[PDB]
Amino acid sequence: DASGVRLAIVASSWHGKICDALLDGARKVAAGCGLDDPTVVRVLGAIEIPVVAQELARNHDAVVALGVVIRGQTPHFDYVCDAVTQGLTRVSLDSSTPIANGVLTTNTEEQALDRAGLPTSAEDKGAQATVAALATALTLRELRAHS
Amino acid sequence: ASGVRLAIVASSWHGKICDALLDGARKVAAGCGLDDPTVVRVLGAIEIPVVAQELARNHDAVVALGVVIRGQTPHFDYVCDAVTQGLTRVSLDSSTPIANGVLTTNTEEQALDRAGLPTSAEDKGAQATVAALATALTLRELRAHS
Amino acid sequence: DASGVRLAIVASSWHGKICDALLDGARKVAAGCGLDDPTVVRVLGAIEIPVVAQELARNHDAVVALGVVIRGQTPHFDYVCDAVTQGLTRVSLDSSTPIANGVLTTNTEEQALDRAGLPTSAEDKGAQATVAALATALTLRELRAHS
Amino acid sequence: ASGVRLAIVASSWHGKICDALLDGARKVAAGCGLDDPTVVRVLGAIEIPVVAQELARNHDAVVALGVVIRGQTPHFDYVCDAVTQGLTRVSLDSSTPIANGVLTTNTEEQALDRAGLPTSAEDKGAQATVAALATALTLRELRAHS
Amino acid sequence: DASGVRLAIVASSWHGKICDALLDGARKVAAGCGLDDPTVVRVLGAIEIPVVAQELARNHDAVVALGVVIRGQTPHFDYVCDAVTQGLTRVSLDSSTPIANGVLTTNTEEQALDRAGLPTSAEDKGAQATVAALATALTLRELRAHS
Amino acid sequence: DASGVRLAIVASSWHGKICDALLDGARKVAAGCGLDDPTVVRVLGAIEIPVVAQELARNHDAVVALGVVIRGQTPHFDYVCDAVTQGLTRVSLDSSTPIANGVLTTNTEEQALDRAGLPTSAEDKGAQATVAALATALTLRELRAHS
Amino acid sequence: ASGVRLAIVASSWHGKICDALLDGARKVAAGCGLDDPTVVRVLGAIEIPVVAQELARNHDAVVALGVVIRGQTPHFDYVCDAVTQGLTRVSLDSSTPIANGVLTTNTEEQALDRAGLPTSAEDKGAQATVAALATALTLRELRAHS
Amino acid sequence: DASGVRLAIVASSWHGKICDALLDGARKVAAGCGLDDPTVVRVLGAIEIPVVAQELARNHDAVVALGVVIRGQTPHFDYVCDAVTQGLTRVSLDSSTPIANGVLTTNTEEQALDRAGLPTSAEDKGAQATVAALATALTLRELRAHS
Amino acid sequence: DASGVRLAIVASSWHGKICDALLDGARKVAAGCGLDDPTVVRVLGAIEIPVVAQELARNHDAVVALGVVIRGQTPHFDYVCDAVTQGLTRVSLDSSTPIANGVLTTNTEEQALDRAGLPTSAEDKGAQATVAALATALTLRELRAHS
Amino acid sequence: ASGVRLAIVASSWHGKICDALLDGARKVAAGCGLDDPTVVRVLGAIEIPVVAQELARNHDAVVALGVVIRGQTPHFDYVCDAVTQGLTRVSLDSSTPIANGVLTTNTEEQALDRAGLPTSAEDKGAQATVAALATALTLRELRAHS
Ligand SMILES: O=c1[nH]c(=O)c2c([nH]1)n(C[C@@H](O)[C@@H](O)[C@H](O)CO)c(=O)n2CCCOP(=O)(O)O
Ligand SMILES: O=c1[nH]c(=O)c2c([nH]1)n(C[C@@H](O)[C@@H](O)[C@H](O)CO)c(=O)n2CCCOP(=O)(O)O
Ligand SMILES: O=c1[nH]c(=O)c2c([nH]1)n(C[C@@H](O)[C@@H](O)[C@H](O)CO)c(=O)n2CCCOP(=O)(O)O
Ligand SMILES: O=c1[nH]c(=O)c2c([nH]1)n(C[C@@H](O)[C@@H](O)[C@H](O)CO)c(=O)n2CCCOP(=O)(O)O
Ligand SMILES: O=c1[nH]c(=O)c2c([nH]1)n(C[C@@H](O)[C@H](O)[C@H](O)CO)c(=O)n2CCCOP(=O)(O)O
Ligand SMILES: O=c1[nH]c(=O)c2c([nH]1)n(C[C@@H](O)[C@H](O)[C@H](O)CO)c(=O)n2CCCOP(=O)(O)O
Ligand SMILES: O=c1[nH]c(=O)c2c([nH]1)n(C[C@H](O)[C@@H](O)[C@H](O)CO)c(=O)n2CCCOP(=O)(O)O
Ligand SMILES: O=c1[nH]c(=O)c2c([nH]1)n(C[C@H](O)[C@@H](O)[C@H](O)CO)c(=O)n2CCCOP(=O)(O)O
Ligand SMILES: O=c1[nH]c(=O)c2c([nH]1)n(C[C@H](O)[C@H](O)[C@H](O)CO)c(=O)n2CCCOP(=O)(O)O
Ligand SMILES: O=c1[nH]c(=O)c2c([nH]1)n(C[C@H](O)[C@H](O)[C@H](O)CO)c(=O)n2CCCOP(=O)(O)O
Ligand SMILES: [K+]
Ligand SMILES: [K+]
Ligand SMILES: [K+]
Ligand SMILES: [K+]
Ligand SMILES: [K+]
Ligand SMILES: [K+]
Ligand SMILES: [K+]
Ligand SMILES: [K+]
Ligand SMILES: [K+]
Ligand SMILES: [K+]
Ligand SMILES: [K+]
Ligand SMILES: [K+]
Ligand SMILES: [K+]
Ligand SMILES: [K+]
Ligand SMILES: [K+]
Ligand SMILES: [K+]
Ligand SMILES: [K+]
Ligand SMILES: [K+]
Ligand SMILES: [K+]
Ligand SMILES: [K+]
Ligand SMILES: [K+]
Ligand SMILES: [K+]
Ligand SMILES: [K+]
Ligand SMILES: [K+]
Ligand SMILES: [K+]
């Protein structure tokens, strides 16, 4: 069910059509699980996600990070992806809070489209990440102090 | 090893392979005198470190189990980077062994060959449990007594 | 608008004409958003950015890092880029302040120029990074304590 | 306040007075919509902060209850110093309100008068619970939404 | 001139008439310095102040703590005052933000009234605390990174 | 019962007859509760206790601190007691481990003798502290991750 | 001592006395050949630690100057407690000497007698600057060099 | 014996003849225990001890703090003693190194002399502190990792 | 002359003949420098090294990490090596203690054998790592507080 | 730049090349009027960060010098990863510039060409010392002063 879980979702905006679709999947999983009012915040790019996730983790049980990084002509793809990976990992462990990674990292636009839960997509990593976030919050809840 | 407090956290992507790793881990534990390790499941490998962190608070050792198989994109690289960074940090923050039994393979056949099924060449779940327990016993002997 | 946010820009100096172009883009975004007088500091190379950005974060709501790293004949490109990624990421999370990454990391000079918002450039990553910094500061302000 | 996660840790020295403080705390909680706060008992006041620390990890607020009454020695001073230092540290480390309902009196009569028994002038357990809940709701409104 | 400084005021409520008087002096100082809308938060008792001050320090340049602790029949007064002192001191240094202590600690009510800036009072410590917060914030601004 | 609790006891040596009696009570409570082999370490004075307790807390579920401070002709009593209080409190919270305080702090030798569980003593604070330590370890065990 | 980077932060409560401590400190620094010390004023003694923290980032030593005189209430005690806790913390966080030239007296006569005016028995502003410089030199000698 | 332990002694200089007497006691214990060449550093006042002790703890197994604080006409005695207590305690726990407190805190000069191990002194707190430091280092060595 | 330095060696056991060869070279270096009894600890795999190195660093002036990682059929090699690198680097800096990296990371067995100081080997990285640890410990001793 | 306290730590693997980087660094420092920089040698590049950490306690800037050249195995990659992670951490922990003059090349010719010998196209030891000094001066200007 997961109805008492306090959920935040932060979604970057680069490749907005794809980002909006990941957000839609995340919000739909949340609503399906009895959460109609997750905290939803938008940032410009994937690199902006961790600092916002850090703020949200102070008062949520779980944060879903959503965005889309697609490789271009330069090495910059590598470093955007390294920053996000390093940042979200650090935020989760500093805050002892699940930070689910639904940031697509693809070689091509077609690969990102296929993973965003658009109408013809094979899958929706935004929805998947949201399941991960909720299930992990629930597990931590059962492990922690209650008596 | 009968006095050591063991936890095992196993992700669930590639479930049959995950369950096989957990079977090898549980059997090593029981053979060493531990019938009741703390066992927790998470969805994907990325979710392991935050749960391992909670478990390290009150266990002498934690075994991380899972299966990451390279797909069409670079996502594989980043999942594996996050697990590595995460487990390493948790071990040092907590001064507790966090054994890495998370398979990272290019193919399913490679993962199956490492999950200790009837035809597998090895069982990395079992190996990771031996590592966890041996390291906990080592730290026990190095630490404050008597 | 961003007229209340305190913005700092630290720009390295290797490939100076491109750095100055990035800085022009950054200042123009800042001025467009109501900020005529951002704190602007220069350093020699990209590796020198994080320690200065850390200092600026003590006193600013957002910092924009600008610079240009272009691949040469050795692996050193990789380790410069790694150091910058690692450092900017840490500084952001230690200080709970957006540190926007406008450090170009390209294979060729042509690619760097095409991303510095010169007249025939396809884009301006210095401008983009400043939008990122300011928008993230505004978001954090709304999330944080006010009455 | 029906969504706030409340914990109460109460020491046990001067048990009847401790139980009276806990009664006032529980009743405030239930009146505010919380029938099932996490409630834990410890022996003496010195033991409260380490338990409050554990509870702060997964509660929005913690109420510390207990009773320290001055005896023949300076020990009273040091028990109260440790509780004060401890609760203050835990609150700030965890960014969670830790309400102080630990009575520190010179006499038993003073403690009884503050435990919300039929003839008591006040109930510091109840007061501390109001403080905990009000502060949690305040921090909720100051923090990140929506 | 403190028009640019972001001021928060947190005031406890034990001895409410006196607390309100301190807050009145604080608000008047802020307004005189060009700040008509400081963030103002009320808490129950003085012991509740530091955790709220901690939250406010993340988003403000100065925080003013107001309240009134008067010695009763027990040693409890001493421990309330100890908690406030240790707490505000730690928050100031953790956050590198001035936390002005306008929390009255008196033996009697007459003493608290005389320090709350009512018509017949010798002084207003609410007002004094606010001057202290703002002046120290402006000092730190000068000392820190700017152009 | 408490038989799986890993217990350490550190006892200072100033006023050795009294210290030895506190240690005897602690060890007897431990044995009564099914622990025949607690880690037992001796230090010279009460000020030496916290650094040793810190080491022991790394691999025990609970530490009992035992010693005897009796006021003399100077203020030094105050500062010995402040150090021990500050140190043990910090060790408990750094290590998230109960550190039971069985350090006597008395005005007179007679008061310390009366609290050491010697034959004619009214009480034994070494035994009391050991109960506190074990009961708290057991409670934390029930609050922590088990599933 | 000419090479040491000195900062002085003085509060302003009892301004004439604070100015006298500052005069003593400045004279010592000039006597030891110091470059123009960084000098900052704050309102009250409680404001000193946070400004001393800023200054310790860029200086080899900081001298804290101020005057706290006991009044009718317990407030004196908490002002002094805050200054003591703060300065001590700042010194150890920054690994920098923070010399304490904050007078804490019962009377105005006692503070005047310690502020190094012509009829004063002592100048604690001067003393504090000597302590700051001596300690900075010692730490330089202890630390990494040729 | 203690011939392998690395000992440092930091002694303040207010009341110099008494400080030198404390230091004599410390060196004599150290030499008795096999250590002819402890690191010895002088500071001006007791308040200067903790920051120097912190430095010495990076490089030594034990540090002995020596000094003499005698009550005067004002409350300042109290705050000097508080600062020393607080600082030595923190340094010990940060560094996981025994920091022995041989700082006399007396009401009169007579009491200080009677505790400095001059010929007619009742005791020698400088010697006592060195026994404490060395014995605690040896205990910690046995508790810690060896094979 | 490293007779005074406290050396620990932690060696993993995957590729045991090669690990033993590295340890042989390490022990011979230590003995040649006047250290007949370094603390030696064995672990299973390279990933187990950093947590044990962390324990040893609390009680030693230098730690030597030995082991052998050889590339197999999967990417696992890369992550084992990443973990070792991140771990030892963090432990060195947290503990301010040299942690020498004598962990071989090769593509083939022949390469690992050639670096393990067997009769036909081009070099002994176990021996090299031990020189590195001891030399760096002696350097730090010179740089740190002494007389 | 005459007032800046400079430290240089150089590793010794490929000793002739390391000595050339050190020569360039020393020449820059002497050119900018620097007091005798603190100079320390370590064996390999991996040993640099811990010694740089010590030096950053007592200096305004540290220059890290060394030579890593790719060999037959992946070892080059992990040596460089360690140096990068370490220096970056040390700089931010100490809030001190740690300039990276550690060459990371595929060949000996590439390192020689970057070590500022007469036929060299570049001197990265010199470049690194300029970066260190320039950054120290900038931070001084940004920090607390008159
Ligand atoms: O244990 C896992 N094994 C995997 O193989 C895997 C996992 N997990 N994940 C993602 C999870 O770790 C997941 O929880 C999300 O990142 C949400 O946090 C994944 O995205 N993968 C798939 C990697 C291949 O992805 P693709 O085929 O290139 O899209
Ligand atoms: O602002 C305050 N002013 C006060 O005078 C006061 C306060 N607060 N408190 C308690 C609060 O701080 C309260 O919040 C609880 O401790 C719960 O955390 C108090 O208990 N007091 C009363 C002190 C005198 O107590 P007594 O008369 O000796 O019982
Ligand atoms: O809640 C408490 N209330 C108390 O009155 C009290 C407590 N606790 N303690 C000790 C405990 O806090 C105890 O747990 C030990 O210190 C062990 O840690 C105590 O020693 N006291 C008694 C204070 C009076 O002591 P005395 O009469 O002067 O020996
Ligand atoms: O020292 C080691 N050397 C190695 O070569 C090695 C090690 N260790 N490990 C794993 C261990 O580090 C192990 O302890 C587990 O990860 C459990 O923590 C390994 O899994 N390997 C093998 C790397 C090659 O794996 P594969 O052949 O690609 O499956
Ligand atoms: O979410 C994102 N997805 C992306 O694909 C992307 C992003 N972000 N960014 C930059 C931002 O992450 C960030 O806002 C910027 O660095 C400022 O901090 C960014 O530069 N890219 C492009 C990566 C490909 O770059 P190129 O095509 O090789 O120039
Ligand atoms: O356990 C203790 N009980 C004590 O009564 C005591 C102790 N210790 N100490 C000193 C030690 O705690 C400590 O070993 C010393 O300061 C060195 O660190 C110590 O100086 N005392 C005496 C307190 C009374 O002092 P005086 O009689 O006023 O000089
Ligand atoms: O070792 C010391 N022993 C002391 O007795 C002493 C010291 N030091 N100090 C000063 C303090 O240690 C000093 O170095 C500065 O305060 C710190 O910079 C002091 O001010 N005192 C004197 C305490 C009594 O002072 P009054 O007579 O009340 O002014
Ligand atoms: O902003 C920069 N852009 C760059 O392209 C660059 C920089 N900096 N650096 C040096 C680095 O930033 C420098 O300041 C020192 O390494 C740090 O002290 C560099 O060494 N590079 C060049 C990277 C390529 O070098 P090669 O041609 O492979 O030698
Ligand atoms: O340097 C100071 N010396 C002092 O004597 C003093 C100071 N400061 N303060 C103010 C305090 O330092 C802060 O400015 C204030 O608490 C706001 O943070 C004060 O409130 N005092 C007054 C101490 C005596 O107070 P009563 O007369 O007992 O009310
Ligand atoms: O400065 C260095 N430059 C280097 O090129 C180098 C170094 N150092 N090291 C040693 C390393 O820095 C440490 O000294 C060692 O790991 C012990 O800590 C090394 O092992 N190397 C060798 C790199 C090439 O290794 P292969 O030829 O692939 O075996
Ligand atoms: K959370
Ligand atoms: K979708
Ligand atoms: K553990
Ligand atoms: K299996
Ligand atoms: K900031
Ligand atoms: K541009
Ligand atoms: K908000
Ligand atoms: K909480
Ligand atoms: K009641
Ligand atoms: K702030
Ligand atoms: K008023
Ligand atoms: K423990
Ligand atoms: K007994
Ligand atoms: K539980
Ligand atoms: K400094
Ligand atoms: K003067
Ligand atoms: K030195
Ligand atoms: K030490
Ligand atoms: K003597
Ligand atoms: K041991
Ligand atoms: K060490
Ligand atoms: K060999
Ligand atoms: K520095
Ligand atoms: K050169
Ligand atoms: K400045």
PDB file of C-alpha atoms in Angstrom, chain A residues 54-55 58, chain E residues 54-55 58:
ATOM      1  CA  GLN A  54      19.484  16.665  -0.312  1.00  0.00           C
ATOM      2  CA  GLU A  55      16.993  19.302   0.807  1.00  0.00           C
ATOM      3  CA  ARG A  58      15.535  16.122   5.239  1.00  0.00           C
TER       4      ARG A  58
ATOM      5  CA  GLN E  54      19.037  25.408  13.366  1.00  0.00           C
ATOM      6  CA  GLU E  55      16.392  25.082  10.672  1.00  0.00           C
ATOM      7  CA  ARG E  58      20.013  27.174   6.774  1.00  0.00           C
TER       8      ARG E  58
END
